[PDB]
Design a protein around this motif. Structure first.
Motif, PDB file in Angstrom:
ATOM      1  N   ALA A  75       0.819  -1.209   0.000  1.00 30.76           N
ATOM      2  CA  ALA A  75       0.000   0.000   0.000  1.00 30.76           C
ATOM      3  C   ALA A  75       0.856   1.263   0.000  1.00 30.76           C
ATOM      4  CB  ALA A  75      -0.946  -0.012   1.200  1.00 30.76           C
ATOM      5  N   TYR A  76       1.846   1.338   0.887  1.00 25.47           N
ATOM      6  CA  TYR A  76       2.675   2.532   0.991  1.00 25.47           C
ATOM      7  C   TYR A  76       4.095   2.328   0.489  1.00 25.47           C
ATOM      8  CZ  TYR A  76       5.005   6.645   2.776  1.00 25.47           C
ATOM      9  OH  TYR A  76       5.738   7.804   2.880  1.00 25.47           O
ATOM     10  N   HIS A  77       4.788   1.288   0.957  1.00 25.73           N
ATOM     11  CA  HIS A  77       6.188   1.067   0.589  1.00 25.73           C
ATOM     12  C   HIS A  77       6.244   0.530  -0.839  1.00 25.73           C
ATOM     13  CE1 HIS A  77       6.811   1.015   5.089  1.00 25.73           C
ATOM     14  NE2 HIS A  77       7.768   1.834   4.690  1.00 25.73           N
ATOM     15  N   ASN A  78       6.035   1.431  -1.795  1.00 21.57           N
ATOM     16  CA  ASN A  78       6.017   1.072  -3.208  1.00 21.57           C
ATOM     17  C   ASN A  78       6.815   2.115  -3.985  1.00 21.57           C
ATOM     18  OD1 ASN A  78       4.117   3.289  -3.559  1.00 21.57           O
ATOM     19  ND2 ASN A  78       2.528   1.882  -2.825  1.00 21.57           N
ATOM     20  N   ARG A  80       5.806   4.689  -5.763  1.00 23.00           N
ATOM     21  CA  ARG A  80       5.361   6.070  -5.603  1.00 23.00           C
ATOM     22  C   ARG A  80       5.949   6.703  -4.346  1.00 23.00           C
ATOM     23  NH1 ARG A  80       1.719   7.991  -9.409  1.00 23.00           N
ATOM     24  NH2 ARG A  80       1.680   6.446 -11.104  1.00 23.00           N
ATOM     25  N   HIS A  81       6.121   5.915  -3.281  1.00 22.99           N
ATOM     26  CA  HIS A  81       6.801   6.430  -2.097  1.00 22.99           C
ATOM     27  C   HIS A  81       8.265   6.731  -2.392  1.00 22.99           C
ATOM     28  CE1 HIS A  81       8.813   6.661   1.734  1.00 22.99           C
ATOM     29  NE2 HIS A  81       9.399   5.494   1.535  1.00 22.99           N
ATOM     30  N   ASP A 118      14.067   1.760  -0.810  1.00 14.07           N
ATOM     31  CA  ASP A 118      13.062   0.811  -0.338  1.00 14.07           C
ATOM     32  C   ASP A 118      12.822  -0.320  -1.331  1.00 14.07           C
ATOM     33  OD1 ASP A 118      12.332   1.309   2.263  1.00 14.07           O
ATOM     34  OD2 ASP A 118      10.719   2.710   1.761  1.00 14.07           O
ATOM     35  N   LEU A 119      13.794  -0.607  -2.198  1.00 13.86           N
ATOM     36  CA  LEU A 119      13.596  -1.574  -3.273  1.00 13.86           C
ATOM     37  C   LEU A 119      13.193  -2.940  -2.728  1.00 13.86           C
ATOM     38  CD1 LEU A 119      16.548  -0.615  -5.599  1.00 13.86           C
ATOM     39  CD2 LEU A 119      14.251  -1.065  -6.451  1.00 13.86           C
ATOM     40  N   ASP A 120      12.190  -3.546  -3.369  1.00 13.95           N
ATOM     41  CA  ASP A 120      11.717  -4.896  -3.063  1.00 13.95           C
ATOM     42  C   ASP A 120      11.100  -4.993  -1.669  1.00 13.95           C
ATOM     43  OD1 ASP A 120      11.298  -7.503  -4.146  1.00 13.95           O
ATOM     44  OD2 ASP A 120      12.905  -8.283  -2.868  1.00 13.95           O
ATOM     45  N   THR A 214      16.383  10.805   6.098  1.00 11.93           N
ATOM     46  CA  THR A 214      15.211  10.564   6.932  1.00 11.93           C
ATOM     47  C   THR A 214      14.155  11.642   6.720  1.00 11.93           C
ATOM     48  OG1 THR A 214      16.550   9.417   8.589  1.00 11.93           O
ATOM     49  CG2 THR A 214      14.405  10.256   9.291  1.00 11.93           C
ATOM     50  N   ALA A 215      14.585  12.892   6.538  1.00 10.23           N
ATOM     51  CA  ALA A 215      13.636  13.979   6.316  1.00 10.23           C
ATOM     52  C   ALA A 215      12.855  13.772   5.024  1.00 10.23           C
ATOM     53  CB  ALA A 215      14.369  15.319   6.293  1.00 10.23           C
ATOM     54  N   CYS A 216      13.532  13.331   3.962  1.00 11.63           N
ATOM     55  CA  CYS A 216      12.836  13.053   2.710  1.00 11.63           C
ATOM     56  C   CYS A 216      11.997  11.785   2.818  1.00 11.63           C
ATOM     57  CB  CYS A 216      13.841  12.935   1.564  1.00 11.63           C
ATOM     58  SG  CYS A 216      14.816  14.427   1.273  1.00 11.63           S
ATOM     59  N   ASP A 217      12.488  10.792   3.565  1.00 12.78           N
ATOM     60  CA  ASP A 217      11.777   9.525   3.699  1.00 12.78           C
ATOM     61  C   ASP A 217      10.394   9.720   4.310  1.00 12.78           C
ATOM     62  OD1 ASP A 217      11.400   6.836   3.437  1.00 12.78           O
ATOM     63  OD2 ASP A 217      12.684   6.253   5.118  1.00 12.78           O
ATOM     64  N   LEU A 218      10.297  10.537   5.357  1.00 15.17           N
ATOM     65  CA  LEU A 218       9.052  10.736   6.086  1.00 15.17           C
ATOM     66  C   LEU A 218       8.283  11.965   5.618  1.00 15.17           C
ATOM     67  CD1 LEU A 218      10.642  10.182   9.626  1.00 15.17           C
ATOM     68  CD2 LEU A 218       9.840   8.430   8.036  1.00 15.17           C
ATOM     69  N   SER A 219       8.716  12.600   4.526  1.00 14.19           N
ATOM     70  CA  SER A 219       8.217  13.921   4.159  1.00 14.19           C
ATOM     71  C   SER A 219       6.743  13.935   3.775  1.00 14.19           C
ATOM     72  CB  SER A 219       9.050  14.486   3.010  1.00 14.19           C
ATOM     73  OG  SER A 219       8.893  13.705   1.840  1.00 14.19           O
ATOM     74  N   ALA A 220       6.090  12.775   3.687  1.00 17.96           N
ATOM     75  CA  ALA A 220       4.649  12.768   3.462  1.00 17.96           C
ATOM     76  C   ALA A 220       3.907  13.443   4.607  1.00 17.96           C
ATOM     77  CB  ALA A 220       4.152  11.334   3.277  1.00 17.96           C
ATOM     78  N   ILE A 221       4.476  13.397   5.814  1.00 18.85           N
ATOM     79  CA  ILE A 221       3.879  14.022   6.984  1.00 18.85           C
ATOM     80  C   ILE A 221       3.833  15.541   6.884  1.00 18.85           C
ATOM     81  CG2 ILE A 221       5.932  14.389   8.406  1.00 18.85           C
ATOM     82  CD1 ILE A 221       2.435  13.000   9.363  1.00 18.85           C
TER      83      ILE A 221
END
Ligand SMILES: O=C(O)/C=C/c1ccc2c(=O)[nH]c(Cc3cc(Cl)ccc3NCc3cccc(F)c3)nc2c1
Ligand SMILES: [Mg+2]
Ligand SMILES: [Zn+2]
Length: 292
Positions: A75-78, A80-81, A118-120, A214-221
């Protein structure tokens, strides 16, 4: 070959047209091919295609290989993320003016890392299938694609540049483990509090690159409220229904993880304030829903 034929033959719209400089960028209305075009534009406007002589069809093939090795059923770790994480890295380098503080090799590694970090991934509730185990698997997938025939976008680098770039790529992907972020953030915060943060120091530069990932990783927030509500939906889908409490869980995640990081990022570069600003407005909205 069909997708590669279409993508290689397309014209790449500008960064302004594609809106990839905006911290509030979203991808809901974009096709897979359109995300591939934004990714080409990211490599182009950072001068990575120029300074490292990437051939067009190799970059297109590499982007399509990276996208293919993300799982749509997650759903999320794909993909598009991963695409969004790279977009935020682009916006932070350009609109956040972080570009001037880093070398070309560092920028090249961060963009590759953000796209590959986040590959695979197969979902948080599929952890069994197999010190940051997943992040090591993610880097291994990243290196295999970088070494695949027709996909070697780093062929133009010397052996010294190549060894350096892979070392940075690996540390950047490893930094996306929240455990590593929790371990090292105290040192990052203490350096800023004492007004002693200096990037010319190699040890502090590597630490800043870790925090930036980490800032880019969680930047959806940090996204505008209608976008964050939808992303929180995807997170809740992956966490619970794959393999309401959401408002208060978003507040705790913002308090425990996000707020300090985006504050520290703003002190380092004041043009990264929209990330801290957007993160604050989302805490306001989520807390109100929690209170009903
Ligand atoms: O790893 C990455 O690339 C990025 C990590 C990431 C990004 C955004 C959020 C967010 O906006 N909120 C929460 C909190 C949360 C809420 C709810 Cl409702 C349910 C679970 C959780 N966290 C656990 C969790 C489960 C499944 C997927 C997932 F990403 C996180 N954590 C996030 C974690
Ligand atoms: Mg991850
Ligand atoms: Zn991630």
């Amino acid at each position: 070959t069909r997708e590669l034929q279409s993508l290689a033959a397309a014209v790449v719209p500008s960064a302004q047209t594609l809106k990839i400089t905006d911290f509030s960028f979203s991808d809901f209305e974009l096709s897979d091919l359109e995300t591939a075009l934004c990714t080409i534009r990211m490599f182009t406007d950072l001068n990575l295609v120029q300074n490292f002589q990437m051939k067009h069809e190799v970059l297109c093939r590499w982007i399509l290989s990276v996208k293919k090795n993300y799982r749509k059923n997650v759903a999320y770790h794909n993909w598009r993320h991963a695409f969004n994480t790279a977009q935020c890295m682009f916006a932070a380098l350009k609109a956040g003016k972080i570009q001037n503080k880093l070398t070309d090799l560092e920028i090249l590694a961060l963009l590759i890392a953000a796209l590959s970090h986040d590959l695979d991934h197969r979902g948080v509730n599929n952890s069994y299938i197999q010190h940051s185990i997943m992040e090591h698997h993610h880097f291994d997938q990243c290196l295999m694609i970088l070494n695949s025939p027709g996909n070697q976008i780093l062929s133009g680098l010397s052996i010294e540049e190549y060894k350096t770039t892979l070392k940075i790529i690996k540390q950047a992907i490893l930094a996306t483990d929240l455990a590593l972020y929790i371990k090292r953030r105290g040192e990052f915060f203490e350096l800023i509090r004492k007004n002693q943060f200096n990037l010319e120091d190699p040890h502090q530069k590597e630490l800043f690159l870790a925090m930036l990932m980490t800032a880019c990783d969680l930047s959806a927030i940090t996204k505008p409220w209608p976008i964050q509500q939808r992303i929180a939906e995807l997170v809740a889908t992956e966490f619970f229904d794959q393999g309401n409490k959401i408002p208060s869980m978003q507040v705790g995640f913002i308090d425990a993880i996000c707020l300090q990081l985006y504050e520290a990022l703003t002190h380092v570069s004041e043009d990264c304030f929209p990330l801290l600003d957007g993160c604050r407005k989302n805490r306001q909205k989520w807390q109100a829903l929690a209170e009903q």
